[PDB]
Amino acid sequence: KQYIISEELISEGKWVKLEKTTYMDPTGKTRTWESVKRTTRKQTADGVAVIPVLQRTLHYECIVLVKQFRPPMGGYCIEFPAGLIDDGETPEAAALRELEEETGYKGDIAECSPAVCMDPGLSNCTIHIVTVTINGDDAENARPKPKPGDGEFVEVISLPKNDLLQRLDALVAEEHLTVDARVYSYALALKHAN
């Protein structure tokens, strides 16, 4: 019933553009929206986010997360490991690659979502969420070496899956960090499944 009529470029940077979207509302009235898009999409989606489940015998299972300075936020954020999918890369391959670059861990694919939207009232950005298990007892994950690209500076924070929400809330209270909404949503549902 609703659809896009036209998209006007307002401003195009190197990485991001701002458009004015004209669309038909369901009453038959024409309306406008200010929309953000990335300039980098080619792909199934802009990026991947990895849910990395660190499995070590006789330990609690952990979810592996990353802490980095985020210039749009003006501060440090706790997130799932994540990055843009390279042209001609599969989401699964982007997931293992980003996980290794950002954390040093080598994981196995468990499942892969369809393309899911990041903030659909604002942008067209999408990701695949890729669940990955990490056999923490294997020798390649003994001393994981993060291989960060240029300008990436990532700290690794592993938190137990069974208390994830309480651990994140503690980090916020004590560290003045911002937790990512996807991370927080995941943590909430671990608690709510009960």
Added chain:
Amino acid sequence: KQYIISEELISEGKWVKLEKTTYMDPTGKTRTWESVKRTTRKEQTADGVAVIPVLQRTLHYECIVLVKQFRPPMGGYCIEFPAGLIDDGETPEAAALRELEEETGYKGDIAECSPAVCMDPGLSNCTIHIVTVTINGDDAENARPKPKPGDGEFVEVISLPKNDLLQRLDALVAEEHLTVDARVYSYALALKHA
């Protein structure tokens, strides 16, 4: 270690702006980023709220109440938690209950309220509170709920059982050409992983 040096306006619309952000990297080198922000944020602790609405009825399985709407940035329909921006002077909790009633017709009870969490921190400064709300679906006020959408708001309600959320979302994606929100999908995935 890292911090913002300057934020230069590139382009400002009615609702969204783009900025050139200069920051200090942990090596001591100046770098730039292209940053998106909303123009609507005042003294709110976040831009918006998203509501996790747990519909509870005797002799029924718990349902998660979701909304489907056309999203001009996406050029299509999206399935999301009920959500909206926080009005000036409004608490996150009040915003939540208000947006839930407006979008779904249901009158909820606050359960929990998250700290401000980031929507897409590599791109934007946008933040929300995630507000968990229970809905007593045996209460007569919640018998035949009618959405009171605002001007230019056109929302469908979709209530799915919590105990099968991920499969039910996958079945909707399989039938109809729509995008699930990343927070919804992350919450559904944790329900499975628990």
